[PDB]
């Protein structure tokens, strides 16, 4: 695309410098341009891609929430159309980043990935980016978006269950599916059963790990515990 004159490795190289500088718009466009070179990505290069687009959408989500609350406070004198126009503009920027990621996986990352850890990583991301769209959806397509996210989430679960151990951090990262249930799907008891089953089966697997791996998994198991303490 925009980055077509630059070598694949220089693009990886500059994504890591942007991270250091905290320049995540630059980081995301460098990694978009690497993806469009046509070759599969390694396990470190995949983490760069998710770190870059998460910090960018993370900022849009937070600003959309401020704006939408002012708009609703102005219902329960009136300042004009200005709040609803500006909230609409931000919202359209977020939907555009979500459509850009979703297009890179469809073209052609998911279909080329044959390893369990590649394929489960991309299918999670797909349910994450339909989720962020659902967070701001209100039309007829809102039930359709909730079902695309669901479907992508479930296919990744089935693979992870039969192909990886219960302490794998990509498998624990299932936390996100429980959030889907609680905050999007209006199914809070489903959300609670998943997080408790997930915590329990990892717990009974810790004895098999090194000190470095122990530390990685207990990180994510603590987030499952915080939510249960909040949802009860």
């Amino acid at each position: 695309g925009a980055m077509g004159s630059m070598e694949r490795a220089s693009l990886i190289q500059k994504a890591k410098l942007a991270e250091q500088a905290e320049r995540y718009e630059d980081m995301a466009a460098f990694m978009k341009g690497a993806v469009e070179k046509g070759e599969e990505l390694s396990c470190e290069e995949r983490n760069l891609l998710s770190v870059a687009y998460k910090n960018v959408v993370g900022g849009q989500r937070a600003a959309w929430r401020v704006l939408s609350s002012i708009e609703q406070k102005s219902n329960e004198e009136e300042k004009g159309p200005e709040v609803r126009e500006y909230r609409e503009k931000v919202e359209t920027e977020l939907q555009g980043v979500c459509d850009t990621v979703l297009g890179l996986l469809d073209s052609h990352l998911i279909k080329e990935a044959g390893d369990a850890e590649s394929r489960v990583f991309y299918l999670k991301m797909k349910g994450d980016y339909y989720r962020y769209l659902a967070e701001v959806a209100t039309g007829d397509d809102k039930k359709r978006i909730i079902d695309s996210a669901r479907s992508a989430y479930q296919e990744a679960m089935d693979i992870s269950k039969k192909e990886m151990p219960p302490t794998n951090p990509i498998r624990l990262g299932a936390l996100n599916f429980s959030v889907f249930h609680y905050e999007i799907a209006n199914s809070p008891e489903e959300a609670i059963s998943l997080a408790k089953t997930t915590f329990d089966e990892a717990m009974a697997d810790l004895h098999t790990l090194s000190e470095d791996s122990y530390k990685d998994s207990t990180l994510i198991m603590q987030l499952l515990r915080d939510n249960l303490t909040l949802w009860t």
Binding site: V51, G173, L175, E183, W231
Partner: peptide, 10 residues
């Protein structure tokens, strides 16, 4: 407040 989702890898 809202629920915790999975953190930025690094």
């Amino acid at each position: 407040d809202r629920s915790s989702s999975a953190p930025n890898v690094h």
